[PDB]
């Protein structure tokens, strides 16, 4: 049993008609101090999977190494490592889920909330969640920490049920993810304006966008707000 | 007296270790395999005797990768070879895990060396029945090595072991002399396919299947990869042609 030190906030994600999108800002907080800004919390594994991690950063870096090792290992004595026997998102998830649960069961958790996003070899979208307790679940949309409260409500207005997936386009979807990031920047006191976004499309493959920024913010009305009730100037 | 050859860690009166020497016999009785160091990498190749038509072609792969930058091929008792790669793979993971950087080929070589040498210290174990050719690209160049059952190993310009090690060693010595400037990855690949076709005469009775792999700073980016399709066929031809 430990206690997180350097942490990463929300990880939002959702699936559309041809794939899945996932995003996470680049902040690495240390309590209330927004200590590190060049932190990539999106771990690409292979080219059909992206792992978004939140929580303790040191533990994240650890899961990062496990993932690289998983790839190296899958390559050993495997002639179909870049074909029929390449890593699937579901394999990567089942593995991580296994570890998370074993560690919580030994009273020494990996203080994280993870979301595995990708596309299975047969084209199916893969989106599942796992945290320090080993708890797991899937939904057309998934978010951790703050995003679970502010992002999901927004994203669900696009994909409320399974039948909405085929009706949603990457454009519509990516738009939602990007607006959700803006909202989180407005209300999450542990968020950054810079973030990373990744798309895993069954036709276009993996697209990984770095250094994005919250844009189109409304702040002007703040000038009309003075005092806290009766003050006029 | 005698009996000096029945227990593994025993010194014979002439300071030798017979069990190790016997293991070598097992290595010489195996398929021939080689290693060709080039200007920015190394190439590996081996002979695969087609016992029958029932063997699925291109399936029973023999060359092995360690980490992502090291290639290993061996002759002798195949299972013993896998056992040594497994150890090397653990050996490598361990190194990267603590030092972060993937393991240097020289460092990796000693790892296998110390381990193999270990199996010549006790009578409770048997020496390895293989000679292994392995190498890769690292912080400072390419490196080619060959490890013997005694745990002995050195860096080579070219190396061969197995049935036709003499044919190969011969072909290799030529290349070394006629190319002081160093062969190239692309060239070494064809050259290799040839050394293998030539060294196959010391086994001309059974049909075979060629296998090549390479690790070049420019052709593969320092990563170990198997030669497949076109590049492979082009090499088989270059060989099948000069075999006449």
Report the order of strands and helices of chain A: EEEEEEEHHEEEEHHEE
Order of helices and strands of chain B: HEEEEHHEEEEHHEEH
Q: What is the tally of beta strands of chain A?
A: 13
Fraction of helical residues of chain A: 25-40%
Number of domains of chain B: 1
The fraction of residues in strands of chain A falls at: 25-35%
Organism (chain B): Saccharomyces cerevisiae (strain ATCC 204508 / S288c) (Baker's yeast)
Main location (chain B): cytoplasm
Family (chain B): Belongs to the peptidase T1A family.
Keywords (chain B): Acetylation, Cytoplasm, Nucleus, Proteasome
Please tell me about this protein's structure.
This is part of a larger assembly, with chains A (233 residues) and B (244 residues). Chain A has 233 residues and is an alpha+beta fold. Chain A has a single domain, classed as Glutamine Phosphoribosylpyrophosphate, subunit 1, domain 1 (4-Layer Sandwich). Helices cover 27% and strands 30% of the residues of chain A. Chain A has helices spanning 57-75, 89-104, 146-156, 170-187; strands at residues 6-8, 12-15, 19-25, 28-30, 33-36, 42-45, 49-56, 112-119, 125-131, 136-138, 141-143, 194-201, 205-213. In chain A, the strands form 2 sheets. In chain A, strands 1, 4, 5, 6, 7, 8, 9 and 10 form an 8-stranded antiparallel sheet that branches. Chain A has a 5-stranded antiparallel sheet with strand order 11-2-3-12-13, with helices on one face. With 244 residues, chain B is of the alpha+beta class. Chain B has a single domain (1-244), classed as 4-Layer Sandwich (Glutamine Phosphoribosylpyrophosphate, subunit 1, domain 1). Chain B has helices at residues 18-28, 78-99, 105-118, 165-177, 185-199, 229-242; strands at residues 33-38, 41-50, 64-66, 70-76, 130-138, 141-147, 153-155, 158-161, 207-216, 224-226. In chain B, β1 (33-38) and β2 (41-50) form a beta hairpin. The chains are: A alpha+beta (233), B alpha+beta (244). The PDB classes it as hydrolase. Keywords: beta-sandwich flanked by helices, complex structure covalently bound to the synthetic inihibtor bortezomib, hydrolase. The entry is titled "Crystal structure of the yeast 20S proteasome in complex with bortezomib". Chain A: Proteasome component PRE4. Organism of A: Saccharomyces cerevisiae.
């Amino acid at each position: 049993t430990q206690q997180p030190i350097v942490t990463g906030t929300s990880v939002i994600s959702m699936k559309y008609d041809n794939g899945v999108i996932i995003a996470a800002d680049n902040l690495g907080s240390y309590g209330s101090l927004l200590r590190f800004n060049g932190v990539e919390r999106l771990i690409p594994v292979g080219d059909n999977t992206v792992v978004g991690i939140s929580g303790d950063i040191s533990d994240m870096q650890h899961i990062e190494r496990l993932l690289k090792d998983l790839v190296t290992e899958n390559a050993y004595d495997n002639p179909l490592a870049d074909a029929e026997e390449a890593l699937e998102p579901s394999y990567i998830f089942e593995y991580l889920a296994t570890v998370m649960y074993q560690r919580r069961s030994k009273m020494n958790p990996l203080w994280n909330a993870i979301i595995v996003a990708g596309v299975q070899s047969n084209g199916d979208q893969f989106l599942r969640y796992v945290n320090l307790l080993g708890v797991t679940y899937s939904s057309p949309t998934l978010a951790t920490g703050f995003g679970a409260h502010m992002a999901n409500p927004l994203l669900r207005k696009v994909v409320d049920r399974e039948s909405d997936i085929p009706k949603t386009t990457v454009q519509v979807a990516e738009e939602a993810i990007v607006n959700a990031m803006r909202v989180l920047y407005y209300r999450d006191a542990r968020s950054s304006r810079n973030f990373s976004l990744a798309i895993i499309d069954k036709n276009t493959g993996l697209t990984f966008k770095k250094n994005l920024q919250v844009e189109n913010m409304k702040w002007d009305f703040a000038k009309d707000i003075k005092g806290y009730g009766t003050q006029k100037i | 007296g005698t009996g000096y050859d029945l227990s593994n860690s025993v010194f014979s009166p002439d300071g030798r270790n017979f069990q190790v020497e016997y293991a070598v016999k097992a290595v010489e009785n195996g398929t021939t395999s080689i290693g060709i160091k080039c200007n920015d990498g190394v190439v590996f190749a081996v002979e695969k005797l087609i016992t029958s038509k029932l063997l699925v072609p291109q399936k029973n792969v023999k060359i092995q990768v360690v980490d992502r930058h090291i290639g290993c091929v061996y002759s002798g008792l195949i299972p013993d070879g896998r056992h040594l790669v497994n150890r090397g793979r653990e050996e490598a993971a361990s190194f990267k895990k603590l030092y972060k950087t993937p393991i240097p080929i020289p460092a990796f070589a000693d790892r296998l060396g110390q381990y193999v040498q270990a199996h010549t210290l006790y009578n409770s174990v048997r020496p390895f029945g293989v000679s292994t050719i392995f190498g890769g690209v690292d912080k400072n160049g390419a490196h080619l090595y060959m490890l013997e059952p005694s745990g002995s190993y050195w860096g080579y310009k070219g190396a061969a072991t197995g049935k036709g090690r003499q044919s190969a060693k011969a072909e290799l010595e030529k290349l070394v002399d006629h190319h002081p400037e160093g062969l190239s990855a692309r060239e070494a690949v064809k050259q290799a396919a040839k050394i293998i076709y030539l060294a196959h005469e010391d086994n001309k009775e059974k049909d075979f299947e060629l296998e090549i792999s390479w690790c070049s700073l420019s052709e593969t980016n320092g990563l170990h990869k198997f030669v497949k399709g076109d590049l492979l066929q082009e090499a088989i031809d270059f060989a099948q042609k000069e075999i006449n």
